[PDB]
Amino acid sequence: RVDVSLPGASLFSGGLHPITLMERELVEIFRALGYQAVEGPEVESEFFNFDALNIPEHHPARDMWDTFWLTGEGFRLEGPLGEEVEGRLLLRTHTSPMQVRYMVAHTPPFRIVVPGRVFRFEQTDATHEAVFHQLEGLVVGEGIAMAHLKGAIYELAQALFGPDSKVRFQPVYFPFVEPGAQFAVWWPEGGKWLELGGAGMVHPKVFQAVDAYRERLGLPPAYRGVTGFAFGLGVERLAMLRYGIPDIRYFFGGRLKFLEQFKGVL
Amino acid sequence: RVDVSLPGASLFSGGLHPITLMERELVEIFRALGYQAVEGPEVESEFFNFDALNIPEHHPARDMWDTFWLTGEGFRLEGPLGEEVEGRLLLRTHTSPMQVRYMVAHTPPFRIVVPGRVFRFEQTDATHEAVFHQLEGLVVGEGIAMAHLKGAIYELAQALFGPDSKVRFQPVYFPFVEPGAQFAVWWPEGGKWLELGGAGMVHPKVFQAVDAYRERLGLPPAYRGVTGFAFGLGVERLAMLRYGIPDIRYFFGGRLKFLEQFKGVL
Ligand SMILES: N[C@@H](Cc1ccccc1)C(=O)O
Ligand SMILES: N[C@@H](Cc1ccccc1)C(=O)O
C-alpha cells in the first residue's frame, strides 16, 4: 500500500523574526499614509545624535539617553552626502539623528519613517534592553501643524487596535521639538492606556542646524519657511503587547523554540 | 579534492507571473496614496456590469464592450452583502461593477483600487486579448474634485516613469462619469505619449443606483452629498511597455521559458 499520510521530504520552512514582523506592519501602516522608509547608520557622531538635535553636552537633558561611546581609528563614517565626517563616535541612542541626515540630503515637503536598531547603556531585564528598536516619523512642509501630528497618531491607533481605539496626547519634554508631547493609545482588549512614544513640532534649532550644515556643504537653505512634526515609538514594547510576549530579552535570545513561533505571522 | 564550484542540490526556485508583478507595483503605488485593494467576482450580473453603471441595453454605448454571455442554473451569485442576486449572467467586461458593489457595502469617504481579470469577445492577436486585466480606482467623499483625479494620475506617472514624466487629459465618453476623460502619460525613454486609461467624476446616476439598491436592501442612503472620481487602466499594455514584452498572448501562453524570465523582478 502507498501510505499517503506519511511524512514527506523534510524541506526546510523559514520564518521572520518578531521585530521584523512588527516593524513591517508599522511601515505598512505609515506607507498607506504617504510615509517612505529610509534607514540610518548605527554608529553615529555626537553631532548627529546630539548637537544637531539641540542636545548639548553637560546638558542635564543629555542624561535622558545612556550613551555607549566608541573608540578606534581607521573607521570612516560618511555623512548625508557620502562625505567623511568627524566627531566622537557612539552608538545612536535613538533614530532621531536620521531626521537630520535626511533633511540635509533632500528637500521639503516629504514624509519619512525611519526604523532601526538603537543602543543605550542599561541593565537588561524583563521589560528593559540595552539593544532595542525604534521607528521615527518626520513630516515637513509649509503649513504642517500639530493637528497633523495628532491626525497621524490617530490613524496609527485605528490601524493598530481597531475603531474602538483612541489616542491621548500630553505635554512632555524633548530638546528637538516644541511643542513637545507623549502619546498613549487605548487598547480595547487590554482595556489599558498604552504609552507608545513621544513627538512634537520640529524644533526651530533643528532646522537651523540642518541649513547651517547645508551651506557649510554648498547646498542652499531649504528649511527656513517650513514646519514639521516628528515622532518616535518603541518597537519591542508594541511587539510584546501585540504578540503576547512576556520577556523582551527573547528577541535577541536566539531560541528557535521562540522564533519558530512566528512562522505563522509570516 | 572537494570541488566547491560543483552544482549543489537542485532545489526548485519559484517566481511570480509578470501580471502579478505589474499589478503589485500598481497596487503599491496607490497604497502609498491611501488606496486599499479589494477584488470583485469575474461572473457578474447585467445589473452590476451595465445597468448600475448607466449603460442600458440596446444602448449604442453598450457596444464599447463585447460581452461574453453565460448560461446554466445551479449557480448562485451573491451580492455586496452576500444576498443572492438575479439577472443575466456574464463575464465582467471591466472591473467597474466593483465600484457599485463596494459603495453599497460601505460608506464614504474612502479610496479603493480594484485589480482583476476581465473578459471581452475579441480576436486575440499581438496587442489584443479576450482575457486581460484592469485596475480600477475609486475615491468618493465631500468636496472630491477633478483636481484630485488629475493629482492621482500625476502621482501615478511620476511613480511609474520618473520626474521627467508627465500626464495629459483629454475629454472622452463613459456612461458612468461626467466630466469624462482619457489620460496619457509621457514615457521619457520611449519619448512617446502612452494612453493608459480612462477616468472621470462618478456619474450622478451611479450614486442614485447605489442608494436605490441600498434602500431596497434596508441600508440608509450614503451618497447624496458626495462626489468622486474613478479611473481604469489596462494592466497588460503597461506590463508590456515596462518589461519590454512584444506579444500580449504570452501572458496566458504558459511558456516557462517566458515566465521564468521574471524570477528576477521577483
Ligand atoms: N528620540 C526620542 C523619541 C522622539 C522622537 C521624535 C520626537 C519626539 C520624541 C526618544 O528616544 O524618546
Ligand atoms: N471601465 C472603463 C475604464 C474606466 C473606469 C472608470 C472610469 C472611466 C473609465 C473601460 O473599460 O474602459
Swiss-Prot record, chains A, B:
Top-rank taxon: Bacteria
Cofactor binding comment, as recorded? Binds 2 magnesium ions per tetramer.
Q: Which GO terms describe its cellular component?
A: cytoplasm
Q: Which GO terms describe its biological process?
A: phenylalanyl-tRNA aminoacylation
What EC number(s) does the entry state? 6.1.1.20
* Residues making up the signal peptide according to the UniProt record: none
A molecular function (GO) term: tRNA binding
Its annotated compartments are: Cytoplasm
Q: Which cysteines are joined by disulfide bonds?
A: none
Its primary localisation, in coarse terms, equals cytoplasm
Q: Does the keyword Glycosyltransferase apply?
A: no
Q: Which UniProt keywords apply?
A: Aminoacyl-tRNA synthetase, ATP-binding, Cytoplasm, Ligase, Magnesium, Metal-binding, Nucleotide-binding, Protein biosynthesis
Catalyses which reaction(s): tRNA(Phe) + L-phenylalanine + ATP = L-phenylalanyl-tRNA(Phe) + AMP + diphosphate + H(+)
Q: How does it assemble?
A: Tetramer of two alpha and two beta subunits.
Q: Which family does it belong to?
A: Belongs to the class-II aminoacyl-tRNA synthetase family. Phe-tRNA synthetase alpha subunit type 1 subfamily.
Q: What is this protein called?
A: Phenylalanine--tRNA ligase alpha subunit
